[model samples]
Target: QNAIKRFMTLFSGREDVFSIQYEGGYRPIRRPLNFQDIKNHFSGKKTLGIYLLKKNDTVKFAAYDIDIKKNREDKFVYEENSKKVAKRLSRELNLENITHYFEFTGNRGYHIWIFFDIPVSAYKIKYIMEKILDRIELEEGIDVEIFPKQTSLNGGLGNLIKVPLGVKCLFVDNDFNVIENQIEFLNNIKENKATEINKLFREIFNE
Candidate 1:
């Protein structure tokens, strides 16, 4: 039973999932990215490509999305860099659950996602995200792109990451990975009831 086992349906079995589409051809059909009664096509043989559906779609959990663009290639060299960068970021997040992947496309873009055990403010998520963005790059011969490039989306999602285990064409996360039910992820992080949320973003954005 992997992490996918926890969520069997979206929105507590709501007849309506926020919505979804494939990565290549279709556009975003719905809300936040989380693993559950996710609609494949979620990434079926008929799936377009990896969709926006970034990890931890629900607002009950706040998430930081790290996006990286790979060179028009894939290999141990690129893999290693992605791995190193991911680990460092993971440390900063200090969360137990994190997910990463490579977009199945021209360059096979890389993605990194960290989800909190409990919901925090979208403010906190965004704050942590900004600092991390200050610390990453492709490094060496790799020239991939990292997300949240300008500090703001200008009226759109921040950086979009892939939904885990949904993309059939991908094998490695490139460096990104996720772990659920983490004990220390939020062990010491204090929560302010005033505001913030990924599901918060999802809630507000979807509205």
Candidate 2:
């Protein structure tokens, strides 16, 4: 499959709305997402974000966003700490045999993403991720955030994440090296099964 096509299929969600980045923040554009917007994002003409939680209160993926806040006494200290936190979280996910990917946001933070074989309940996804996060010892200034920030959007649109493999967001390996041939990397990757998620939840929570 084509790289762009593969990327679109993997990260796609809401068709009614998408987001475009301005100077910093994102503005939601109400329309069906098309190939051009994604093409523009990779070309550096624009940056885009996608609403993760589907309208049915289910999600195809979830992510943990570990940000290094800009305002601090020592910026690098926060950056390093944030990086360590990301690695720790990633390692924990790995140890638990969770299928996930880690990405650098082209800024001071990193995002750890987990794709699902089928759309899973947003509530369950958020609960599991939050539980996992609760177990991690986050240091001061390491701002850990989660996608599907809410269990459901209700009547409104939910949060969005900067799609990976774009100019501004790129996936990285455990060594923190930017992955080359990203499409091939993604192609070779696998998604976690819903049963796996349930099992992991049960095991970790000792249910």
Candidate 3:
């Protein structure tokens, strides 16, 4: 609850930020399941998932750390810092077609998910993740590179795992935290009260 509160307060002002959906499905695809079972599960859905397809060829994957807590008070400062870091990291790697970047509003951080114009295979994704980690040196005041090689690519299935054709990754609130459902609850917040939320968060942080 405290963590959700902190997140809401910090990002209340940014209404334009994208919202992630939660992905729910039965494990072990071989298990027998009927279409009715799936339909019964998602009868009336308010949101849809965002799917990022796997590459047909080898592609590069890199990891980065953005220090959000260092300048949490100023939203612009956070944006500027993250962009600078991302640009530098992308330039260093010579990556082209940086497609998407998302800001997880209910969290104290950001995610820059980049996709290149050229498709890369799953094995290459694993290789890229490893190279990114190797290039990045650990430093104080920076968020740890959570998406290391060990982190599962497809819902803990493994690295370079192929996502099913139709289903996309959901970025719902509280999806980051399994113990709580913060994303669904955030719908209760008033639509135009981001400033209030930001001020409240700043107050809690004593900024």
Candidate 4:
């Protein structure tokens, strides 16, 4: 659990000006055209679209039961949280050259998209995520717990720390939408969903 310990140390030292949310992920998006695609989409882009999901007990139960609602309060909460998180993250990170958009995942969490014209590597993106996780850990007073064996994933405590090599896309439309389809889908196939989510993320950013 060295990785977990390292993450815990790293995460717990950050400023605790923000609230911590339990569920979150990232999705990387590629441009529609190949030539348009580059190492970092934020390069030369001004605004990024971010979506976050927030799920309450009723919303979680409905999704678990495959009960769908066209519009839900959970979505609004996610949207609100996303903006707050994005704003706080940008300020804390000193992201002066970026603009962000926050959106609701229409399910149970929130997403934050960072748009910048500055060139950033995958390693840089991963570093940003780690920083955010550290902040969350400190604010929530939670220990970063990671899997012991490196059988599949590279790093992180329980889901808190992620290495640069293990970086994946932080935003995706389809994957996020599908998760909102039904709560049972998540309950029965959480691992599978996570795999797909990870795969989609890699496909977007790993050119």
Q: Of the candidates shown, which would achieve the greatest TM-score relative to the real structure?
A: 2
TM-score of each: 0.46, 0.90, 0.33, 0.27
C-alpha positional error of residue 49 in candidate 1 after TM-score superposition, expressed in Å: 9.5
Q: Which of 3 and 4 is ahead in lDDT?
A: 3
List, residue by residue over 22-67, the lDDT tens digit for candidate 4.
2354233323212122112224222122111111100000000011
Candidate 1, poorest ten consecutive residues by summed lDDT:
7-16
Off by over 4 Å in 4: 1-87, 94-97, 137-207
Clashes of 3: 14
Ranking by lDDT: 2, 1, 3, 4
* Best of the two (2, 4) by lDDT: 2
The better-scoring model by lDDT among 1 and 3 is: 1
Local accuracy of candidate 3 as per-residue lDDT tens digits, 164-201: 11133222221233223434443332222223323433
Instruction: State the C-alpha lDDT per candidate.
Output: 0.38, 0.82, 0.34, 0.28
Could you tell which candidate, 3 or 4, scores higher by TM-score? 3
Question: How would you encode candidate 2's per-residue C-alpha lDDT over 1-207 as one tens digit per residue?
Answer: 377777776786786898998886999989988888878888888788899878888888889999876664657777778888998888778887788888998666898989888788888778788877888899777799988887877787988888876665788988778989787898877888898887776776676
lDDT minimum window of 10 residues, candidate 3: 157-166
Task: Write model 1 residue lDDT over 25-103, tens digit each, in one string.
Answer: 4454454444433444343533322222233332322333322443445566655665565556656444412332222
Best by lDDT: 2
Instruction: Evaluate candidate 3 by giving its C-alpha RMSD to the native, one decimal.
Output: 16.9
Which order, best to worst by TM-score?
A: 2, 1, 3, 4
Pairs of residues clashing in candidate 2? none
